[PDB]
């Protein structure tokens, strides 16, 4: 996916 949407999944 997009970058920002991707780091959100990891942090959560």
């Amino acid at each position: 996916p997009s970058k920002r949407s991707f780091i959100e999944d990891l942090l959560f």
Partner: antibody, heavy 126, light 109 residues
Framework: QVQLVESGGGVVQPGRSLRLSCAAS????????MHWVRQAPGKGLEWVAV????????YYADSVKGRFTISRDNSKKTVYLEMNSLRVEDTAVYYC???????????????????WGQGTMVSVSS | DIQMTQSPSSMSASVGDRVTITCRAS??????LAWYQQRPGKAPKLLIY???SLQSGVPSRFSGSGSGTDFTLTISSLQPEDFATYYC???????????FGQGTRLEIR
């Protein structure tokens, strides 16, 4: 453009409950997490709660734990906040916002989106 | 309960002056600090993130520095639109908490 609008604000007696809603438009609501931040009159900002894009992980501030519940519906591009057992100190302007996450560099990034709604006033008084 | 100590609480300066606002974290937040601007009766505006990056649209006179616990937002020659209240945020603990500074009021001298 991208716009977040808050609705459902008003007055509520202490001890009772009240539900907030925030409608998002102009971008993929499922591609970003949502936050609630309040601001008491004359005071600073205070982050309240966050919902992930998949609506599975919830986190609340310690002051509102056990009282506030946050939900979302990607089909309506809306994020909700059900506030229960409200107190006078909860009186603030509640902003529905999409905040900047870490790990983002390169100043002109399209993934550094950080915009706020105009906010709604919730008055807890008796 | 990550705390951000902002200083000064209030500031006064004239148009064309240079001012510095500092933010102090209670623990190592790396470079994940952001600077916000808020005008009376309006929602906050993001100015700086990653402690040095400029959000799209903000003029060059807004600059930030710092890593770890001490951070510094420096504004070059001021403009009338620049006189407002500023806050610093941290995103190191992004999932479970985001905290703000108490704020600095920039008053026109």
């Amino acid at each position: 453009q991208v716009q977040l609008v808050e609705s459902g604000g008003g007055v509520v007696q202490p001890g009772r409950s009240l539900r907030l809603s925030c409608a998002a438009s102009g971008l993929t609501f499922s591609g970003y997490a949502m936050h609630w931040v309040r601001q008491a009159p004359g005071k600073g900002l205070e982050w309240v709660a966050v919902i992930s894009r998949d609506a599975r992980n919830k986190y609340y501030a310690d002051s509102v734990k056990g009282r506030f519940t946050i939900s979302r519906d990607n089909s309506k591009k809306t994020v909700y906040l059900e506030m229960n057992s409200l107190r006078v100190e909860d009186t603030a302007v509640y902003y529905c916002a999409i905040l900047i996450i870490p790990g983002i560099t390169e100043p002109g990034s399209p993934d550094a989106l950080d915009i706020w709604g105009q906010g709604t006033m919730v008055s807890v008084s008796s | 309960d990550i705390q951000m100590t902002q200083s000064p609480s209030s500031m006064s300066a004239s148009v064309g002056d240079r001012v510095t606002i500092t933010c102090r974290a209670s623990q190592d937040i790396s470079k994940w600090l952001a600077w916000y601007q808020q005008r009376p009766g309006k929602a906050p505006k993001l100015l700086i993130y990653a402690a040095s990056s400029l959000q799209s649209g903000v003029p060059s006179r807004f600059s930030g520095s710092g890593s770890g616990t001490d951070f510094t937002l420096t504004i070059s020659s001021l403009q009338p639109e620049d006189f407002a209240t500023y806050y610093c945020q941290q995103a190191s603990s992004f999932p479970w908490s985001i905290t703000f500074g108490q704020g600095t009021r920039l008053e026109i001298r």
